[PDB]
Amino acid sequence: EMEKEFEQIDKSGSWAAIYQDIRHEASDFPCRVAKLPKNKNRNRYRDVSPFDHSRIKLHQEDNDYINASLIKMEEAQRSYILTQGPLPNTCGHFWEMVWEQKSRGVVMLNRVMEKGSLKCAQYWPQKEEKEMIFEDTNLKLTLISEDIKSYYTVRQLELENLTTQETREILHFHYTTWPDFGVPESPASFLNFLFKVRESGSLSPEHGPVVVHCSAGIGRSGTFCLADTCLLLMDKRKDPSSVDIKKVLLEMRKFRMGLIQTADQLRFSYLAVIEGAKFIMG
Numbered sequence: 709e710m711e712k713e714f715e716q717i718d719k720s721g722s723w724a725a726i727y728q729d730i731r732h733e734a735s736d737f738p739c740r741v742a743k744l745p746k747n748k749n750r751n752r753y754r755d756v757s758p759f760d761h762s763r764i765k766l767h768q769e770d771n772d773y774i775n776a777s778l779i780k781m782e783e784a785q786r787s788y789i790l791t792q793g794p795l796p797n798t799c800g801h802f803w804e805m806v807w808e809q810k811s812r813g814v815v816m817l818n819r820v821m822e823k824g825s826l827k828c829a830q831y832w833p834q835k836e837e838k839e840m841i842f843e844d845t846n847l848k849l850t851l852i853s854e855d856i857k858s859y860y861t862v863r864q865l866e867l868e869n870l871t872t873q874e875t876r877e878i879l880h881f882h883y884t885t886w887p888d889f890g891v892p893e894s895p896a897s898f899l900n901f902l903f904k905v906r907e908s909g910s911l912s913p914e915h916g917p918v919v920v921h922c923s924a925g926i927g928r929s930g931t932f933c934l935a936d937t938c939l940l941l942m943d944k945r946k947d948p949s950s951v952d953i954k955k956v957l958l959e960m961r962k963f964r965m966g967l968i969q970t971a972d973q974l975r976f977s978y979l980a981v982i983e984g985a986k987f988i989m990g
């Protein structure tokens with residue numbers, strides 16, 4: 709019972725302690741491609757890189773690098789691509805990946821500007837009549853529609869491969885209410901957001917893996933993927949109380965570093981899964 713476990717950590721206020729045990733037990737793999745000089749400008753943070761073993765490769769002979777990792781959850785039979793918030797110069801790479809990986813959805817858990825500074829580039833068109841064109845990767849992006857809601861917005865975008873003239877519909881699931889500091893009051897809205905994404909079919913096998921990102925693409929994006937997988941696991945196995953989130957988080961960290969950056973985020977994941985269980989259970 710993770711909830712019982714939850715109350716014990718809270719009781720003895722040992723979340724920071726536990727979070728640290730995870731950091732120490734977390735995997736450590738090479739990130740040689742990421743650190744090459746030629747890729748300096750393709751990374752937003754010096755300390756956040758994709759392990760080579762699980763990095764996403766752009767289908768181009770020039771430079772195939774993009775700071776993004778493929779998180780494969782074998783048992784849950786669910787895959788996610790976690791990536792940093794595109795930079796002014798990597799937006800075309802970002803959409804090239806989406807096209808190449810055949811992703812159906814894009815999950816954004818942050819705002820272009822937070823705490824008075826840029827946390828991500830404006831990589832999608834804001835107005836229908838103002839489409840964007842990424843010359844380097846020869847892609848055209850068009851805002852088709854947008855549904856603004858209280859805690860999040862869903863956008864319908866059309867991505868076209870100018871080379872082939874082929875087009876695809878892409879769903880942009882953007883969570884707009886994540887606090888500047890800390891984590892959400894209650895997981896309620898976050899969980900509904902997650903369900904909306906599931907409902908769209910973006911997380912389903914008939915599509916490439918979903919692309920999730922925040923700023924570094926590890927903290928909040930971690931929270932999102934960890935909760936989804938956990939809820940899914942409880943949905944598969946016979947003993948839903950046999951799902952150990954710390955174990956699942958470590959499994960994910962074999963694919964990308966620092967998923968879940970703080971004790972607050974870790975605590976929040978518990979709330980999300982726990983609160984989410986009383987519902988997804990039936």
Ligand SMILES: CCc1cc(C[C@H](NC(C)=O)C(=O)NCCCCC(=O)N[C@@H](CCSC)C(=O)O)ccc1N(C(=O)C(=O)O)c1ccccc1C(=O)O
Pocket residue numbers: 731734735736737752753754755756827888890922923924925926927928929965966967969970
């Ligand atoms: C925009 C916020 C943010 C920045 C960075 C980059 C950062 N800084 C630099 C370059 O100044 C950073 O915090 N780096 C610390 C290291 C992160 C990687 C990690 O855990 N590495 C391992 C080492 C590698 S693996 C074995 C480690 O234990 O240190 C990483 C994560 C986050 N970040 C994120 O959620 C995110 O965007 O991923 C947050 C972190 C803490 C609290 C809140 C948030 C939030 O978004 O609300």
